[PDB]
Amino acid sequence: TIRILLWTFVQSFKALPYVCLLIAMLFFIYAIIGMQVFGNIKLDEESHINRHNNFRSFFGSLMLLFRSATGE
Amino acid sequence: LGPHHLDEFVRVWAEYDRAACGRIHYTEMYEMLTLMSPPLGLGKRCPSKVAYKRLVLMNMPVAEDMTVHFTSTLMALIRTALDIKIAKGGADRQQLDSELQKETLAIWPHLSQKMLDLLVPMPKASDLTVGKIYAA
Amino acid sequence: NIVRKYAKKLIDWPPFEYMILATIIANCIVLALEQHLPEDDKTPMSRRLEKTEPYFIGIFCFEAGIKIVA
Amino acid sequence: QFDNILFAVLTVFQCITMEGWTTVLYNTNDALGATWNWLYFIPLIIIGSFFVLNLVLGVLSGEFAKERERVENRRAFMKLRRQQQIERELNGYRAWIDKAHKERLLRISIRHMVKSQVFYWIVLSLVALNTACVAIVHHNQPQWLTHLLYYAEFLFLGLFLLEMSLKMYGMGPRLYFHSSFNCFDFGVTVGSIFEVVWAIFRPGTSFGISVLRALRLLRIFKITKYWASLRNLVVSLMSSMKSIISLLFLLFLFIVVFALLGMQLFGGRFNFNDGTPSANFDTFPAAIMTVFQILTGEDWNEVMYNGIRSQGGVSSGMWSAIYFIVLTLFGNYTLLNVFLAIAVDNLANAQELTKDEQEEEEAFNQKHALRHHMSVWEQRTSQLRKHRACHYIVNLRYFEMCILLVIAASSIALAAEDPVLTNSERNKVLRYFDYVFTGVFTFEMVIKMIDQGLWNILDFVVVVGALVAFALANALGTNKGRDIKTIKSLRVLRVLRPLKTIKRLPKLKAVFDCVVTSLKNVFNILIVYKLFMFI
Amino acid sequence: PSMRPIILVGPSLKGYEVTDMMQKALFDFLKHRFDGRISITRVTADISLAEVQSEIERIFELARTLQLVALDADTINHPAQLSKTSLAPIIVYIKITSPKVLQRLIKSRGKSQSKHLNVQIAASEKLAQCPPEMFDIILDENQLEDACEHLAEYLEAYWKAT
Amino acid sequence: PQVLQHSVDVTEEDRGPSRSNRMEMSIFYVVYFVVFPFFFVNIFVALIIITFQEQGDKMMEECSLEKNERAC
Ligand SMILES: CC(C)CCC[C@@H](C)[C@H]1CC[C@H]2[C@@H]3CC=C4C[C@@H](OC(=O)CCC(=O)O)CC[C@]4(C)[C@H]3CC[C@]12C
Ligand SMILES: CC(C)CCC[C@@H](C)[C@H]1CC[C@H]2[C@@H]3CC=C4C[C@@H](OC(=O)CCC(=O)O)CC[C@]4(C)[C@H]3CC[C@]12C
Ligand SMILES: CC(C)CCC[C@@H](C)[C@H]1CC[C@H]2[C@@H]3CC=C4C[C@@H](OC(=O)CCC(=O)O)CC[C@]4(C)[C@H]3CC[C@]12C
Ligand SMILES: CC(C)CCC[C@@H](C)[C@H]1CC[C@H]2[C@@H]3CC=C4C[C@@H](OC(=O)CCC(=O)O)CC[C@]4(C)[C@H]3CC[C@]12C
Numbered sequence A: 001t002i003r004i005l006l007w008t009f010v011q012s013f014k015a016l017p018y019v020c021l022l023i024a025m026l027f028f029i030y031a032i033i034g035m036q037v038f039g040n041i042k043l044d045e046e047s048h049i050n051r052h053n054n055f056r057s058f059f060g061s062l063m064l065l066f067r068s069a070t071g072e
Numbered sequence B: 001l002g003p004h005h006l007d008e009f010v011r012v013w014a015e016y017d018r019a020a021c022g023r024i025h026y027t028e029m030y031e032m033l034t035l036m037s038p039p040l041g042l043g044k045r046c047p048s049k050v051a052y053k054r055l056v057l058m059n060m061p062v063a064e065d066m067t068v069h070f071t072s073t074l075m076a077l078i079r080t081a082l083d084i085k086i087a088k089g090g091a092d093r094q095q096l097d098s099e100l101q102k103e104t105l106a107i108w109p110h111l112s113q114k115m116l117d118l119l120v121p122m123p124k125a126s127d128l129t130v131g132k133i134y135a136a
Numbered sequence C: 001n002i003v004r005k006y007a008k009k010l011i012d013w014p015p016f017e018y019m020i021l022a023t024i025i026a027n028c029i030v031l032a033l034e035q036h037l038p039e040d041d042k043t044p045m046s047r048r049l050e051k052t053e054p055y056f057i058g059i060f061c062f063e064a065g066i067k068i069v070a
Numbered sequence D: 001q002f003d004n005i006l007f008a009v010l011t012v013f014q015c016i017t018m019e020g021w022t023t024v025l026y027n028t029n030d031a032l033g034a035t036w037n038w039l040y041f042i043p044l045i046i047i048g049s050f051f052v053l054n055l056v057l058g059v060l061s062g063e064f065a066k067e068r069e070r071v072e073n074r075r076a077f078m079k080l081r082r083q084q085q086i087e088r089e090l091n092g093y094r095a096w097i098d099k100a101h102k103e104r105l106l107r108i109s110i111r112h113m114v115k116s117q118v119f120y121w122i123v124l125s126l127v128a129l130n131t132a133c134v135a136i137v138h139h140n141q142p143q144w145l146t147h148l149l150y151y152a153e154f155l156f157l158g159l160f161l162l163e164m165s166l167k168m169y170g171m172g173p174r175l176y177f178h179s180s181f182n183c184f185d186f187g188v189t190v191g192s193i194f195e196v197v198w199a200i201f202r203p204g205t206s207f208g209i210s211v212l213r214a215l216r217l218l219r220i221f222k223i224t225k226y227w228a229s230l231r232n233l234v235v236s237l238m239s240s241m242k243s244i245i246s247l248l249f250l251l252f253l254f255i256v257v258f259a260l261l262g263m264q265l266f267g268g269r270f271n272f273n274d275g276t277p278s279a280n281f282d283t284f285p286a287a288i289m290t291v292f293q294i295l296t297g298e299d300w301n302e303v304m305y306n307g308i309r310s311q312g313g314v315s316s317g318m319w320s321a322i323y324f325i326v327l328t329l330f331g332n333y334t335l336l337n338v339f340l341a342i343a344v345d346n347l348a349n350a351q352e353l354t355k356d357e358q359e360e361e362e363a364f365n366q367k368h369a370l371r372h373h374m375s376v377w378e379q380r381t382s383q384l385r386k387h388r389a390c391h392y393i394v395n396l397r398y399f400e401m402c403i404l405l406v407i408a409a410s411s412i413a414l415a416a417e418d419p420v421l422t423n424s425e426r427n428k429v430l431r432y433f434d435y436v437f438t439g440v441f442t443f444e445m446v447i448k449m450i451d452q453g454l455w456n457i458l459d460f461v462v463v464v465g466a467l468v469a470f471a472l473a474n475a476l477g478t479n480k481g482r483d484i485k486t487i488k489s490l491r492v493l494r495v496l497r498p499l500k501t502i503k504r505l506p507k508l509k510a511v512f513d514c515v516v517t518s519l520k521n522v523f524n525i526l527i528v529y530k531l532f533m534f535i
Numbered sequence E: 001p002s003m004r005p006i007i008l009v010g011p012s013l014k015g016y017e018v019t020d021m022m023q024k025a026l027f028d029f030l031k032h033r034f035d036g037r038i039s040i041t042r043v044t045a046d047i048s049l050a051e052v053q054s055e056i057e058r059i060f061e062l063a064r065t066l067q068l069v070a071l072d073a074d075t076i077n078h079p080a081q082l083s084k085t086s087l088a089p090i091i092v093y094i095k096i097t098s099p100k101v102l103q104r105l106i107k108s109r110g111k112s113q114s115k116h117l118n119v120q121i122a123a124s125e126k127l128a129q130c131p132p133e134m135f136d137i138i139l140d141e142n143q144l145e146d147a148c149e150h151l152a153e154y155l156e157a158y159w160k161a162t
Numbered sequence F: 001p002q003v004l005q006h007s008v009d010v011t012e013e014d015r016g017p018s019r020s021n022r023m024e025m026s027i028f029y030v031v032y033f034v035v036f037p038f039f040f041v042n043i044f045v046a047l048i049i050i051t052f053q054e055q056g057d058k059m060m061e062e063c064s065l066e067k068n069e070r071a072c
């Protein structure tokens, strides 16, 4: 009964390969905008642009945006 | 019915019959339907004339040992439960079956007339069924 | 202990269910008014209220009594 | 920490509720190295927190479809649809009342004018001034505004008094409370009188219930075709109100029970040497408003840490991580099954109510006075209830598919810019790539405009921005006020290069259009949302 | 008669303001929209008793002037009540296809006629059992504009036919 | 929670806070939640669920006689 749910709901993820390409494209667009605009803020451990949370790199900005999406 | 009930048919087939395209005659029918849960029909508590009047709605041709096919019976249960293009008998049910065959080709063209004829077994009025045996 | 002639089942009725409904509201208000102080300390009002718990306990054991005998 | 299994199934439960999962990710990045940890905490959030919301929404929506069709529910819905039929024909019949010293001499022209289509619009264009007057107040508003708006509250209040009495003394108090917003306007008027008096006798707090008149702007919907979709929603809400109130009341009882339980466990134990936190459990109004946090589930983390160090620490005290788990689970999920049942029920009702207007006024009378885009939910529930010459050789099978590769390479080259090191090696290499990419894009935009004349506006904007930035950076770069930022900002337009794929890929375009049509579906409610949020 | 006389009926007993206002609204439409071809006349006598028969000649002579004459009769609310006379009127049935809206309309009109609800309901219900063919035109559709259009259509067809 | 903390600790215009003063301004923050995060957001989820059209259906009126449960 767990397996039937998992199969059923993963199949329908395999039938929407473009619905989760629009979300990847949203994340990409906003990560690039972030790198351009907030990429050179000086990191300050007192603020929330830390060594952990910064727009300094593509993957750092991707992590920042995922952190925000998950409401953090 | 969705396919959720429909795979129980494979289990009861493999265990109670092991037919491999035939090897049922008719005993397996009421050896099948008279026990398993009733989204497919009879069930345990209904081995009566209610079962009789269900079977008289299912009609389908015969084979070497008075046997029948796997998927022919599959569609038999499916349509007798969901009411998918079935009449009360006669050439009426065969013309409804012609409608059904047209619909099946309309959905699936990839079905060869071997398999397609298997899915539309074409029980003509002259050809007696495994349904109209214990009924009459 | 199956003694018939209850006469208590007719007390389970229109008015004594609308008084229990009010004792429960009063009790919830009393539980709302309470304040919890850190280490065995008690406000004056909480000491004042701790002298109503027997009333509510009395009414509720009375409800158990009448429902059980009826 | 992940020490026991019980400390790990609690840290991971915290991360799945998405509260403070990045602090855990950052701790393990520091303690082990930041290369592999993202593989544990991203799929823990994607699988455990998003995918499980998807499962829960799906399961509940299936249950709501299967429960709307039970006999005892179809019955209570037909009882609503019939009464809507009664009122719908009854109002039409009440239109037949068209009858044509001062008891009849002036009180004949009042009720005439005070229902004319110019009167509704005067009132609705003056309430829209009222709600623009009380929306410009701010802090330190210039001293003339304070007095101007001071006169304005009285002016508008008196004016609404007049144009309310003209409906009451001019049309009749007995038959006055027979229109819902007429009762509402009377209520808002009396409330504004309350507010005036209470401001007079207690200057200070002025919570000002006169912006509520902005609700009348919803009457504007009457002039559109979206009126039925919304009046039916309000009808289905107002019918099922003894069962929405008796259900918010059960949410309130269980919040009260959990507030009292938290007072028992943690009452007065929160007086730490730092100072008692604001998320207390000492008194009742402060226990209610921390059980509310834990339900809305936001920073239940910190409350649990306080409630653990309250009863000990990571020590005899961790048995009380079980009040904050049984209240952040059975709260984040019983409050989406309550508020989704309410909103799916009362909105499938208003969708089937409005499907039986167009199925009568547009299919019964229009015949007897002489599927079809049915959604997935509607299909399923009905099934349940039943039980120039040269350039045209642009097309080469390798032009609309070879530009797609350039779009992909340009998008990827966007990712590799160093934001900080303005003049490093990479940024120069990518600037040369920028020349290449704008060259390709213009050499294809021009030929397309040749074959097409005069989604493409996106291509145009990007190429124009690229050309302008290149021109005015190559030309001088100086002698214009602070125009390094000008090139830096017209290079943000480059980020639109990925967007160009949407029109190219016929299925990405289809998913994008599905998103847009969903946005248009929720747009008569997005505006009601914006209006309430403004209030 | 040269042209069939006009009588409308169906809500309830004429003399109760519900039926009064309904018939008056449609008659006033007939006037204002067709002002210059039709004349409305008022009858306070019992035509089922045909002073009683002195008015039928007047009815004939208005009908003999090649202009439509609608009757504001004040006693007839049945199709069977006028199954004997030779007038042969065009009968319009102002129907209400559901009772509950009727009783809500009745209580809706102030209070006094709420002292007549029970008995008016009997007449309306019995009208619902009267034969349909006994009526030339059915008027039940909720709106005034559409019912007025329906009457305009039928009577313009009548006027073109003669 | 921090905005609620600021909103209760509130005294008068151009005066600083006082802890847990005006504790009734928390009513504004529950009537808010009952309306926007709980009620309208679930109104939106329900409108998007109820009115969701099948993605690709232009095959002779969506298999006019054999549909989802019949067809599959
Ligand atoms: C050691 C404790 C603390 C937890 C151990 C892990 C559990 C989360 C796992 C272990 C065994 C699992 C169970 C093994 C078998 C079943 C029966 C199964 O039920 C059915 O499918 C119903 C029968 C049917 O309709 O076919 C699925 C759930 C459940 C309880 C599984 C749910 C997940 C369980 C409880
Ligand atoms: C930690 C969790 C989230 C990941 C576990 C993996 C699941 C996403 C996958 C892995 C293997 C899958 C199984 C692989 C094969 C099958 C057989 C297959 O059976 C059928 O098609 C239905 C039954 C039948 O008709 O025979 C689909 C279900 C099942 C059990 C799958 C169910 C989903 C499973 C458990
Ligand atoms: C529902 C899913 C399947 C849709 C498609 C995926 C997207 C939801 C995106 C948005 C958030 C993205 C993630 C955001 C954060 C990261 C961390 C990032 O980390 C690193 O490359 C280095 C380490 C570090 O982050 O510091 C790698 C990409 C990844 C996994 C991203 C992968 C793609 C994700 C999951
Ligand atoms: C038609 C209705 C629904 C909306 C009308 C819009 C106004 C309600 C908004 C539009 C822009 C807003 C303004 C944007 C900026 C400012 C400046 C700012 O005030 C100051 O600069 C503080 C010092 C000073 O008052 O001089 C805050 C108030 C104000 C006028 C805002 C007040 C509210 C305004 C006028």
Ligand SMILES: CC(C)CCC[C@@H](C)[C@H]1CC[C@H]2[C@@H]3CC=C4C[C@@H](OC(=O)CCC(=O)O)CC[C@]4(C)[C@H]3CC[C@]12C
Residues within 6 Å of the ligand: D409, D412, D413, D416, D425, D426, D429, D430, D433
């Ligand atoms: C991950 C890739 C395979 C996706 C598809 C895109 C690639 C075909 C190209 C397009 C632009 C290329 C980039 C263009 C310029 C550069 C700068 C070039 O020079 C340096 O950065 C060297 C620095 C050093 O020596 O450390 C290194 C490769 C890189 C990042 C290229 C990496 C490969 C990219 C992304």
Ligand SMILES: CC(C)CCC[C@@H](C)[C@H]1CC[C@H]2[C@@H]3CC=C4C[C@@H](OC(=O)CCC(=O)O)CC[C@]4(C)[C@H]3CC[C@]12C
Residues within 6 Å of the ligand: D205, D207, D209, D532, D535, F024, F025, F027, F028, F029, F031, F032, F035
């Ligand atoms: C537009 C729709 C959603 C109607 C629902 C909105 C109102 C009915 C709500 C919005 C916020 C609520 C207010 C927010 C907070 C307060 C402050 C609270 O304290 C006071 O201001 C009174 C005592 C004082 O501070 O002196 C009294 C209730 C009140 C006005 C609430 C009463 C109900 C209000 C006006």
Ligand SMILES: CC1(C)O[C@@H]2[C@@H](CO[C@@]3(COS(N)(=O)=O)OC(C)(C)O[C@@H]23)O1
Residues within 6 Å of the ligand: D063, D064, D067, D068, D240, D241, D242, D243, D244, D247, D341, D342, D343, D344, D345, D346
């Ligand atoms: C399955 C679904 C959608 O949720 C159930 C059940 C019956 O109706 C509910 C819906 O809440 S409400 N008050 O809008 O009618 O009302 C109650 C009686 C609360 O139960 C609701 O329908």
Ligand SMILES: CCCCCCCCCCCCCCCC
Residues within 6 Å of the ligand: D180, D218, D219, D221, D230, D231, D233, D234, D528, F035, F039
């Ligand atoms: C007869 C009333 C017509 C109203 C037209 C606009 C209605 C818009 C939807 C109202 C939803 C109210 C929800 C309030 C928060 C619980």
Ligand SMILES: CCCCCCCCCCCCCCCC
Residues within 6 Å of the ligand: D252, D283, D285, D288, D289, F023, F024, F026, F027, F030
């Ligand atoms: C769900 C409705 C109840 C909300 C409870 C929080 C607000 C409490 C308002 C009254 C506060 C009185 C404070 C007295 C001193 C602590």
Ligand SMILES: [Ca+2]
Residues within 6 Å of the ligand: A071, A072, D018, D019, D020, D298, D299
């Ligand atoms: Ca958070």
